[PDB]
């Protein structure tokens, strides 16, 4: 259907590289932030029906990160530097970090959009 699958590999390469480049909890949890960037890349013109596929692996499949009475939704790690977070929530980010890698794998079959 598409005509640039070769370009998709570029974004996917980052997802896999993040997992392989991570081993410890602090490294993975901290690396998870970079993984989120790859997600927005596939948010150029996604539909509700199509995006539903990914939602099935985040909405009722992944967990959220409660920090400062302001947890996130949609399986993802928000930017929280120097906050009143706990050691029980910091680790939770790692649980989704690994799973996120596999999820982004399928997302590769669509498109991307770099910007910063």
| DSSP tag of 3 | S
CA distances from 80 to 11, 30, 58, 73, 83 (A): 24, 11, 20, 15, 6
Contact assessment for residue 113 and residue 42, using Cβ atoms and an 8 Å cutoff: yes
Tokens of 59: 């909405």
- What is the C-alpha end-to-end distance of the chain, expressed in Å? 28
Q: How was this structure determined?
A: NMR
95: phi then psi, degrees, rounded to nearest 5: -60, -35
């Amino acid at each position: 259907m598409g005509y640039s699958d070769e370009d998709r590999e570029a974004d996917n390469l980052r997802i896999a590289e993040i997992i392989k480049n991570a081993q410890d909890d602090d490294s993975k949890i901290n690396s998870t932030q970079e993984l989120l960037d790859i997600y927005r890349r596939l948010y150029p013109s996604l539909t509700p029906e199509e995006r539903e596929s990914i939602d099935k692996f985040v909405n009722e499949h992944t967990d959220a990160i409660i920090i400062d009475g302001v947890p996130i939704q949609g399986g993802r790690k928000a930017r929280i530097v120097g906050k009143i977070v706990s050691p029980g929530v910091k680790g939770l980010a790692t649980g989704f970090f690994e799973e996120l890698g596999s999820k982004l794998a399928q997302l590769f079959a669509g498109e991307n959009l770099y910007f910063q």
